[PDB]
């Protein structure tokens, strides 16, 4: 009895999936819950890309050594992002590109934050920032510092005064701090986007929302319409409302998904009600057969299968050109000829079969015409005059005392005679719509949707051409009872199509509706049969279902829950599609940029890598339904602006440096010594900080290094000189560099002799074996390399000779990076890092977004 | 158009509410005749909307014998009359081989005996009334758009009245004189 | 196109629903021909064209 | 994963009775050998299926 958006959507999925499962290949099911999909997409729309914090994340941390005058500065950004992504291997490009996508995602995730209500204290009438807002962690080294350096540190703290600056005609607090370059870049980009939006975009978005509410009979609160004009509120427009529908429709082969989402998001819920019980059962004017039905009841309750069939009928009626009916006859289910013979009558009134669009296939038209022919000739309680025509087609006769030709009732899709589209203007264009791709207005039976009606009195004494002609034809044949019954049912018919027209014109207006250009070409394509676009969905229906549909109506009890919040979902979906497209483009450009070290791969690899990281809600939405179509979609130039895209493009631009991702190929090998300190004056050694690293201050000098690769090593191994050449080079204290494979770097800190695997590990592996009568050998390069830092701790007890081994210990691997990861500085320049400008909003200031106002 | 009313009012007007096709949601607080053949019962049900049972040799019962006058009045075919009188002959034989039968032959006798009143001659609208539901539940207080009050009381009516008056935009009607049921029916007609 | 023009509407849908199976079969045939049946015993190009 | 190396064991003597790069003219110059070549190819390369 009851219906709803999600329920009818689930029914549509079941029908379409059952239809499509009939043919499958490769000889290798589930119906997704639309409730879960809608909840997930709404939650994703409600999500915030940025985040509001009172204190920025720590950028630099310090490790205190035994020395009172020296300390190490560690950049937190590099030490932590090395854990982002798994290890790299050269055999599988897909995992490598997935790791690249995760790494570039991490920078964008870290760089998006907003400062608000920073904790500060007053001093001498001037506001001074508290020691936690600035991004340093110097508190750990304080307890060991001497008084005179500590006083300088305190004075530097005293200098953190706060000034004022105007942004968007609003005063904000400005101060200096410390942050990493990649994060600061994204922060500046976000800020600039915030200032850029405030000019014109917000007003246009609010105006478009007002227009959409005007058309769709939606009234919004003043918190959505006029709240942005306050002087104490900043609206950060993460999502822009006037989304171009081309982005949604450019994804290949998504007609089914678009139709399903259109049904799910904005279909009202309601009930099926029988007509007024003041209309008696229709009595047939036929001579009595011993088992035939005298009358066909209207208050009888149909079976569940017939309920599904009438649901199909109504669903296809509410979508003019996208869904089409079709007959189906069961082997059993013994039915009298009367029910079919009157369904053939009601079919000519329920559906339209030409002019602008069609609701039924040509086979259904032929079957209905044959049924009407049989009804008109073969039914009579008394002799009736009849005349016949020459041609051998159904409905070539003239019946009744008057010469009423029945040729007009034969279906003809070129002109649409004999059905609802008989000499009526079904489609018209009046004014521009909120969505520019759907300007058409549908009107069944010429009823205008601009005027409200009352069910009690509407429809009395008003007719359209097809109904009047059909009544005249029926009364001419001498079937008085049927004519009276059909005359009595007219107001119910008018009210039902009024409700349907209102639902189509008012509620279902969305981007998911079919565009005008594709809508206009549906009928000619069906006539010609040269289907090149998406084919319309065909549904099965029975004979009794036509009668039950004609004897039922759809009444919307109340509107859909998610009707008010559809545009935000549409905008976020389009934004995610645009983000994936730009990610694909940037991946292709990056792969083209460095072919020497990047692994060659096909589009199906990194497209899958991107899809692996995309939000699950979008994937579920898009997967409700090759490579050529993928390339065609990628090459399309339609993009959807958004904050996420603005941050993603900047992240991709910042990703041009592999060192920012800490992926390097400059791995060298050179025999070196682990230092053995004198340790004769332990206090003097302790005062002077000492440490050893694998890092190289400068790359090794040219002409002192030899270059190797896979083919050089294989050629050397072909004669057995590989190990010999390596040993000779090491005895010559020369440098050797490997290349080709991009490696990953790991940072670790030790306080004593490190574990051997990293102490004496080799970036390459060599092996050989024999099978049959031939010798064989293998060579490989390790893809994971580690960088460690050694801090030498000493205590009064040990002897000077304790830290001097009898024989040398050798370390091989070396790594060069062109930026400062860990630096040894004196306590003077602890606060010298503060050189970056920050802007923070006041505590009384408010940050708002459109999704927050709608209370998602 | 959803209305809230005291439970006794809907209890007293359930018959009229059913006749006018408004569905009833209420919470409590603490021999018939048969036709010889199914065709005549179906015809009379179609004509008057009155459900009629069929005689099936159950027990000594009371039988309605539709007469030639009503046979012509109802537009019954010749075969219906033939099968009616065949069943009549069968009953004659059954009671001769040793149940009461009444030969009702006026329209008014049939109406005053059993069934619903005949139909008036006005144009038939799409729906009899503009209201769908009248209820007496706190579970659907937000469902309602208007409510009706009366001096009569229910153990749950005070709380429902308080929870319904809190609505920002709700139509309120009260009855002070006359008959409560007549006022309620007039309101449900004009609303 | 000819089936639709001739009025054979019933079997047109049946043919339309069969395309993926037909294309998969012919793709498998092409794979087998080009990948597995390659040997010196394969017919030379000139005699194939002749 | 392995790449062949040019090595000769001091205790092995190799024999190679056949040369691998067979010339197709030798097999396709035999007159009336079309059926023979087809049978040999379909015996040596055609796979089974279902």
mmCIF file of N, CA, C and O in Angstrom, chain A residues 276-281 288 294-295 297 455-456 488 491 495 555 558, chain B residues 21 39 42 46 77 79 119 122-130 143:
data_model
loop_
_atom_site.group_PDB
_atom_site.id
_atom_site.type_symbol
_atom_site.label_atom_id
_atom_site.label_comp_id
_atom_site.label_asym_id
_atom_site.label_seq_id
_atom_site.Cartn_x
_atom_site.Cartn_y
_atom_site.Cartn_z
ATOM 1 N N UNK A 276 -13.366 6.596 -5.355
ATOM 2 C CA UNK A 276 -14.495 6.806 -4.462
ATOM 3 C C UNK A 276 -15.406 5.584 -4.489
ATOM 4 O O UNK A 276 -15.820 5.149 -5.572
ATOM 5 N N UNK A 277 -15.736 4.996 -3.333
ATOM 6 C CA UNK A 277 -16.668 3.856 -3.326
ATOM 7 C C UNK A 277 -18.047 4.201 -3.854
ATOM 8 O O UNK A 277 -18.865 3.290 -4.037
ATOM 9 N N UNK A 278 -18.329 5.474 -4.106
ATOM 10 C CA UNK A 278 -19.552 5.911 -4.765
ATOM 11 C C UNK A 278 -19.592 5.534 -6.235
ATOM 12 O O UNK A 278 -20.558 5.890 -6.921
ATOM 13 N N UNK A 279 -18.580 4.843 -6.751
ATOM 14 C CA UNK A 279 -18.573 4.341 -8.118
ATOM 15 C C UNK A 279 -18.666 2.826 -8.048
ATOM 16 O O UNK A 279 -17.771 2.167 -7.503
ATOM 17 N N UNK A 280 -19.745 2.276 -8.594
ATOM 18 C CA UNK A 280 -19.989 0.847 -8.517
ATOM 19 C C UNK A 280 -19.098 0.094 -9.502
ATOM 20 O O UNK A 280 -18.433 0.678 -10.361
ATOM 21 N N UNK A 281 -19.089 -1.229 -9.360
ATOM 22 C CA UNK A 281 -18.322 -2.072 -10.265
ATOM 23 C C UNK A 281 -18.881 -1.979 -11.680
ATOM 24 O O UNK A 281 -20.094 -1.879 -11.881
ATOM 25 N N UNK A 288 -24.886 -13.747 -21.299
ATOM 26 C CA UNK A 288 -24.319 -14.442 -20.152
ATOM 27 C C UNK A 288 -23.755 -15.789 -20.576
ATOM 28 O O UNK A 288 -24.454 -16.620 -21.171
ATOM 29 N N UNK A 294 -19.814 -11.356 -14.336
ATOM 30 C CA UNK A 294 -20.824 -10.330 -14.581
ATOM 31 C C UNK A 294 -20.220 -8.934 -14.488
ATOM 32 O O UNK A 294 -20.517 -8.057 -15.306
ATOM 33 N N UNK A 295 -19.369 -8.714 -13.490
ATOM 34 C CA UNK A 295 -18.742 -7.422 -13.267
ATOM 35 C C UNK A 295 -17.327 -7.639 -12.752
ATOM 36 O O UNK A 295 -16.983 -8.714 -12.257
ATOM 37 N N UNK A 297 -14.745 -6.119 -10.044
ATOM 38 C CA UNK A 297 -14.738 -5.277 -8.858
ATOM 39 C C UNK A 297 -13.589 -4.275 -8.904
ATOM 40 O O UNK A 297 -12.553 -4.495 -9.539
ATOM 41 N N UNK A 455 -8.766 18.040 -4.244
ATOM 42 C CA UNK A 455 -9.276 16.743 -4.717
ATOM 43 C C UNK A 455 -10.788 16.622 -4.677
ATOM 44 O O UNK A 455 -11.356 15.846 -5.456
ATOM 45 N N UNK A 456 -11.459 17.359 -3.790
ATOM 46 C CA UNK A 456 -12.894 17.167 -3.600
ATOM 47 C C UNK A 456 -13.691 17.550 -4.842
ATOM 48 O O UNK A 456 -14.641 16.851 -5.212
ATOM 49 N N UNK A 488 -18.198 8.254 -15.227
ATOM 50 C CA UNK A 488 -18.187 8.483 -13.786
ATOM 51 C C UNK A 488 -16.770 8.550 -13.227
ATOM 52 O O UNK A 488 -16.526 9.261 -12.247
ATOM 53 N N UNK A 491 -13.371 12.309 -13.075
ATOM 54 C CA UNK A 491 -12.685 13.187 -12.108
ATOM 55 C C UNK A 491 -11.515 12.521 -11.404
ATOM 56 O O UNK A 491 -10.490 13.170 -11.157
ATOM 57 N N UNK A 495 -7.695 13.911 -11.517
ATOM 58 C CA UNK A 495 -6.938 14.192 -10.301
ATOM 59 C C UNK A 495 -5.641 13.392 -10.281
ATOM 60 O O UNK A 495 -4.589 13.897 -9.864
ATOM 61 N N UNK A 555 -1.065 9.234 -4.126
ATOM 62 C CA UNK A 555 -1.255 10.462 -3.354
ATOM 63 C C UNK A 555 -0.036 10.727 -2.486
ATOM 64 O O UNK A 555 0.221 9.961 -1.538
ATOM 65 N N UNK A 558 3.688 13.144 2.120
ATOM 66 C CA UNK A 558 4.596 14.231 2.458
ATOM 67 C C UNK A 558 5.877 14.065 1.655
ATOM 68 O O UNK A 558 6.169 12.987 1.133
ATOM 69 N N UNK B 21 -15.212 7.200 4.658
ATOM 70 C CA UNK B 21 -13.918 6.683 4.217
ATOM 71 C C UNK B 21 -12.727 7.377 4.865
ATOM 72 O O UNK B 21 -11.654 7.450 4.260
ATOM 73 N N UNK B 39 -24.569 -15.083 -7.879
ATOM 74 C CA UNK B 39 -24.736 -14.031 -8.879
ATOM 75 C C UNK B 39 -25.638 -12.913 -8.368
ATOM 76 O O UNK B 39 -25.335 -11.728 -8.558
ATOM 77 N N UNK B 42 -23.739 -10.917 -5.788
ATOM 78 C CA UNK B 42 -22.768 -10.044 -6.437
ATOM 79 C C UNK B 42 -23.449 -8.831 -7.058
ATOM 80 O O UNK B 42 -22.951 -7.705 -6.949
ATOM 81 N N UNK B 46 -22.851 -4.992 -5.931
ATOM 82 C CA UNK B 46 -22.434 -3.963 -6.876
ATOM 83 C C UNK B 46 -23.396 -2.782 -6.862
ATOM 84 O O UNK B 46 -22.974 -1.624 -6.956
ATOM 85 N N UNK B 77 -30.437 -11.039 -15.438
ATOM 86 C CA UNK B 77 -30.629 -11.756 -16.688
ATOM 87 C C UNK B 77 -31.552 -12.957 -16.486
ATOM 88 O O UNK B 77 -31.918 -13.321 -15.365
ATOM 89 N N UNK B 79 -30.851 -16.109 -17.104
ATOM 90 C CA UNK B 79 -30.143 -17.229 -16.491
ATOM 91 C C UNK B 79 -30.105 -17.101 -14.973
ATOM 92 O O UNK B 79 -30.183 -18.105 -14.256
ATOM 93 N N UNK B 119 -28.006 5.214 -3.471
ATOM 94 C CA UNK B 119 -27.055 6.323 -3.767
ATOM 95 C C UNK B 119 -27.793 7.597 -4.194
ATOM 96 O O UNK B 119 -28.834 7.477 -4.869
ATOM 97 N N UNK B 122 -25.717 12.965 -7.380
ATOM 98 C CA UNK B 122 -24.864 14.134 -7.561
ATOM 99 C C UNK B 122 -23.634 13.708 -8.360
ATOM 100 O O UNK B 122 -23.351 12.512 -8.469
ATOM 101 N N UNK B 123 -22.909 14.664 -8.944
ATOM 102 C CA UNK B 123 -21.624 14.324 -9.568
ATOM 103 C C UNK B 123 -20.666 13.731 -8.545
ATOM 104 O O UNK B 123 -20.615 14.161 -7.391
ATOM 105 N N UNK B 124 -19.903 12.735 -8.980
ATOM 106 C CA UNK B 124 -19.008 11.998 -8.094
ATOM 107 C C UNK B 124 -17.631 12.644 -8.140
ATOM 108 O O UNK B 124 -16.985 12.678 -9.193
ATOM 109 N N UNK B 125 -17.180 13.158 -6.997
ATOM 110 C CA UNK B 125 -15.852 13.719 -6.907
ATOM 111 C C UNK B 125 -14.783 12.654 -6.757
ATOM 112 O O UNK B 125 -15.060 11.471 -6.560
ATOM 113 N N UNK B 126 -13.528 13.096 -6.859
ATOM 114 C CA UNK B 126 -12.410 12.172 -6.706
ATOM 115 C C UNK B 126 -12.334 11.607 -5.295
ATOM 116 O O UNK B 126 -11.898 10.465 -5.111
ATOM 117 N N UNK B 127 -12.744 12.381 -4.294
ATOM 118 C CA UNK B 127 -12.681 11.930 -2.912
ATOM 119 C C UNK B 127 -13.843 12.532 -2.137
ATOM 120 O O UNK B 127 -14.257 13.663 -2.406
ATOM 121 N N UNK B 128 -14.363 11.768 -1.176
ATOM 122 C CA UNK B 128 -15.516 12.228 -0.408
ATOM 123 C C UNK B 128 -15.137 13.366 0.533
ATOM 124 O O UNK B 128 -15.871 14.354 0.653
ATOM 125 N N UNK B 129 -13.995 13.249 1.207
ATOM 126 C CA UNK B 129 -13.562 14.237 2.183
ATOM 127 C C UNK B 129 -12.096 14.574 1.960
ATOM 128 O O UNK B 129 -11.329 13.780 1.411
ATOM 129 N N UNK B 130 -11.713 15.772 2.397
ATOM 130 C CA UNK B 130 -10.346 16.248 2.248
ATOM 131 C C UNK B 130 -9.430 15.791 3.374
ATOM 132 O O UNK B 130 -8.224 16.053 3.314
ATOM 133 N N UNK B 143 2.037 14.422 13.588
ATOM 134 C CA UNK B 143 1.356 14.126 12.331
ATOM 135 C C UNK B 143 0.193 15.080 12.087
ATOM 136 O O UNK B 143 -0.119 15.390 10.933
#
